[PDB]
Amino acid sequence: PPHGELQYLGQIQHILRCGVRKDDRTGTGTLSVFGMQARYSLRDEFPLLTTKRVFWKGVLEELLWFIKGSTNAKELSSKGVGDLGPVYGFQWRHFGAEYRDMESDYSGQGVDQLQRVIDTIKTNPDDRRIIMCAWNPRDLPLMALPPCHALCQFYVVNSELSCQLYQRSGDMGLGVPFNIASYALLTYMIAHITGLKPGDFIHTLGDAHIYLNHIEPLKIQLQREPRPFPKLRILRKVEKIDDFKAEDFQIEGYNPHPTIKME
Amino acid sequence: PPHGELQYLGQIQHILRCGVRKDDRTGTGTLSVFGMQARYSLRDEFPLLTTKRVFWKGVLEELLWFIKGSTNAKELSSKGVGDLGPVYGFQWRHFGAEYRDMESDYSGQGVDQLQRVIDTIKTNPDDRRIIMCAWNPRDLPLMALPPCHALCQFYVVNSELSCQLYQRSGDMGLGVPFNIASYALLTYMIAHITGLKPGDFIHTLGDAHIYLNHIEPLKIQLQREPRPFPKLRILRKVEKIDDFKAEDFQIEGYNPHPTIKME
Numbered sequence: 001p002p003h004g005e006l007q008y009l010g011q012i013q014h015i016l017r018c019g020v021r022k023d024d025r026t027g028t029g030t031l032s033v034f035g036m037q038a039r040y041s042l043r044d045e046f047p048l049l050t051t052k053r054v055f056w057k058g059v060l061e062e063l064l065w066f067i068k069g070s071t072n073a074k075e076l077s078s079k080g081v082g083d084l085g086p087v088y089g090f091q092w093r094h095f096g097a098e099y100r101d102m103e104s105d106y107s108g109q110g111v112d113q114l115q116r117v118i119d120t121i122k123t124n125p126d127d128r129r130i131i132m133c134a135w136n137p138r139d140l141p142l143m144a145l146p147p148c149h150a151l152c153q154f155y156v157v158n159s160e161l162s163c164q165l166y167q168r169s170g171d172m173g174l175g176v177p178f179n180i181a182s183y184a185l186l187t188y189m190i191a192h193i194t195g196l197k198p199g200d201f202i203h204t205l206g207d208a209h210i211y212l213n214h215i216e217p218l219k220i221q222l223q224r225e226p227r228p229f230p231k232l233r234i235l236r237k238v239e240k241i242d243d244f245k246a247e248d249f250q251i252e253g254y255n256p257h258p259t260i261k262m263e
Numbered sequence: 264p265p266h267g268e269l270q271y272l273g274q275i276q277h278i279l280r281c282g283v284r285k286d287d288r289t290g291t292g293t294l295s296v297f298g299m300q301a302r303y304s305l306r307d308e309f310p311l312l313t314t315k316r317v318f319w320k321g322v323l324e325e326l327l328w329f330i331k332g333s334t335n336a337k338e339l340s341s342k343g344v345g346d347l348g349p350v351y352g353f354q355w356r357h358f359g360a361e362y363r364d365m366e367s368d369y370s371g372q373g374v375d376q377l378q379r380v381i382d383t384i385k386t387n388p389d390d391r392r393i394i395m396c397a398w399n400p401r402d403l404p405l406m407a408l409p410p411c412h413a414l415c416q417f418y419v420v421n422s423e424l425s426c427q428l429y430q431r432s433g434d435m436g437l438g439v440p441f442n443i444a445s446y447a448l449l450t451y452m453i454a455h456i457t458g459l460k461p462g463d464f465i466h467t468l469g470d471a472h473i474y475l476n477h478i479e480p481l482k483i484q485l486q487r488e489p490r491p492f493p494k495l496r497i498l499r500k501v502e503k504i505d506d507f508k509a510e511d512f513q514i515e516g517y518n519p520h521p522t523i524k525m526e
Contacts, residue, residue, distance in 0.1 A: 020420045023389055034418040034425045035465030037300040096408055111408050126286055128432040128470050129402065131410035139392065145359055145374050147394035151414070153431055153469045155297040157283045162297045164469055166429055168416055169391040202298030204467050206416045206427055207391050 005049055005226035007038035008180075012172060012218050015210045022209065030209035036170070037205070040180060042198030046232035047184045048251060049177045051224040052260040057081055059181045060246055067114065067241060069093030072102040085137045092132065117154055118241060121194045125156035152183065154190070160199035161191040170205040173214035173262045179203070185232070192234050193241055213263045221260055230254035268312055268489035270301035271443075275435060275481050278473045285472065293472035299433070300468070303443060305461030309495035310447045311514060312440045314487040315523040320344055322444045323509055330377065330504060332356030335365040348400045355395065380417055381504060384457045388419035415446065417453070423462035424454040433468040436477035436525045442466070448495070455497050456504055476526045484523055493517035
C-alpha cells in the first residue's frame with residue numbers, strides 16, 4: 001500500500017499544475033483548487049508528515065490548550081510554542097456562552113461540544129451526528145449566524161473511531177500538515193478515553209490553496225521521499241479528556257526530512 | 264476523460280466490497296464507509312445519472328419548493344411529485360426565525376441563507392465563507408445547538424461558480440443520485456442569476472452507506488454502462504432566484520437506462 005503522505009504530496013503537485021490564481025482576504029495571491037480529500041490511517045501509526053519536520057511540540061501543546069478552553073495566549077506561549085477572545089478552546093467547551101474575559105468563570109455555561117462528542121460516542125456509537133464545529137472569532141461580530149470555519153465529524157464501527165475534518169479553506173503549505181497531526185491526535189485522545197481504537201482521519205477541504213511565496217519551498221519538498229510514519233503512544237491510562245498532559249504522549253520512530261520554513 | 268458517473272459506480276462498488284455492517288437510527292442494516300468524495304463537471308453538461316432513470320421532475324419540483332421557503336407538503340405533492348414543520352425551505356429562507364405555521368408571514372424574519380449566498384457572490388466572489396447549512400427538523404427539538412445535516416459551500420474563480428455539498432450521511436442508493444442532480448441544479452440557477460458559468464459540483468460524505476435491501480438492485484446497476492450526460496438549458500433570462508419556474512428549465516439529450524426501484 002502506498003505511503004499515506006503521497007496524497008498530500010500529490011495534492012500539492014496538483015495545485016501547482018492546475019491551481020488557479022485567487023486572492024485571499026488580504027489580497028495576497030495563491031494557486032487554488034476547490035474540493036479536496038485525503039485519508040490517513042491511524043492504525044498502528046500516526047500521520048506526522050515526514051517530507052519536512054512538523055512542529056509536533058506546537059501541535060500537542062496547542063491542542064491541550066484548546067481542550068482547557070483557555071482564551072489566554074500566555075497559557076500557550078509559556079509552554080514554549082494575553083486575552084485572545086472567543087478562540088477555538090472557548091467554542092469547543094463553552095459554545096453559545098457569551099465571552100467576557102480570560103478570567104471569567106464559564107462553568108456549565110454554553111454547550112461543551114467536546115464532552116458532548118465523547119458522551120454521544122459512549123451512549124450511541126452508531127450516531128451520524130457526532131459533530132463538533134469551530135468558528136474564526138473574526139467572523140463572529142461580522143454577521144448574524146456566521147458560517148463555521150471547520151467541522152469535525154466522528155464515526156464509530158468495529159470498536160474503531162474515525163474522524164473527518166472539513167475546513168472551508170486550507171493553507172496547504174503551513175496549515176494542512178499541522179492540522180493533519182492535530183486532529184489525528186485528537187482522534188487518538190478521544191479513542192483512548194472511550195476505549196476504542198483509532199481508525200481513519202479524513203481531511204476534506206473547500207478552497208485548498210498554496211500561497212505564492214510557498215511554491216518554491218514546496219517544489220523542493222516534493223522532491224523528497226516519505227519515510228514510514230511514526231507511532232504515537234499514550235503511556236498512561238487516562239479517563240477524562242481534561243486529564244491529558246503533554247508528558248502522556250510519546251512520538252516514536254520519527255525521522256523526518258529537514259525543517260522547511262514557509263513565509 | 265472518464266465519464267463522471269464512474270465515480271458513483273466506483274463508490275458503490277467500494278461499499279459492497281469493503282463496506283462495514285452498521286445499523287441506522289431505526290436499527291435497519293447498511294454496508295458503510297466513512298469519508299467519500301466525487302467531483303462532477305457542470306461545464307456544458309449536467310450530472311443527471313444515466314445508469315438508471317433519475318426522477319428529474321421530482322428534483323426540479325422539490326428544489327423550487329425549497330426556494331419558496333414553503334413548509335406546506337401540499338404545495339409540493341400538488342405538482343405531481345400538510346404542515347411539514349421547519350423543513351429545508353424555511354431554514355434556507357428564514358434561518359433562525361421561530362416557526363409558527365405554514366401560513367404565518369415570515370417576511371424579513373430570520374436569516375435568508377440563500378439570498379445571502381447570492382449577495383456575497385456578487386459583492387465579494389473570493390470569499391471563503393459562501394456557506395449555506397440545513398438541519399434535519401427532527402434534530403431541532405432534540406438538543407441545544409444541534410449539528411447540521413448538510414452544508415453547501417460555494418466558490419468562484421474565472422467567472423465560474425462551483426459548489427461543494429457535505430452531508431454527514433448519504434443514502435448511496437436512493438438519496439445520492441437525486442441530491443447530485445438537486446445541488447447541481449441549484450448551482451446552475453445561482454450561476455445564472457449571478458452571471459457566472461457553472462464549474463464543478465463536489466459531493467462529500469461522512470457515513471456513505473448502502474441499505475441491505477438495495478444491494479442486489481445496485482449490483483445490477485453496476486453492470487450498466489454510463490451514457491453521455493445530458494445538458495441543462497435555461498431558456499429564459501431570470502434575475503431573481505424566486506422568479507424561476509419549472510418551465511424555465513429543459514434537460515436535453517437524456518437517455519438513461521431503465522428505472523431501478525430501491526426499497
